[PDB]
Amino acid sequence: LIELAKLCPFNYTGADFYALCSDAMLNAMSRIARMVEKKVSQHNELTGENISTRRWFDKIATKEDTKVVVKMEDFLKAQEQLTPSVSRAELNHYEAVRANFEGA
């Protein structure tokens, strides 16, 4: 987490951090979903049983598969993809508001 704190500039907001964490979790989930898809596809041939992902989700999607695990690279890649939701001009405008509303 300290590395992420280092990378992030000083324009991030709680919404931005929430979005970043959501994207990282989504990437981890993409990994998990793809791996379950490979499980189902390969098992369709090995056993010849074309058991759609539905039956896996009901019976064969064990807790570990349901378990969500994330890696640093997910957050880092989302950070590279991350784009703040406010312009530095708007930050300066709000700083102008703060100047008159805090210095006196």
């Binding site: 500039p9 324009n11 784009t83 703040p84 939701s85 406010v86 312009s87 530095r88 001009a89």
Partner: protein, 37 residues
Amino acid sequence: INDLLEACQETKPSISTSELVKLRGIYDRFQKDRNGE
């Protein structure tokens, strides 16, 4: 193919170059602003 070529010649861009470049600039500036740089 010839009828296709006639249609191509008749057709003109739904967007005039002025609006194309204007919207391209606006959208690029918005993408950069979102990028916060």
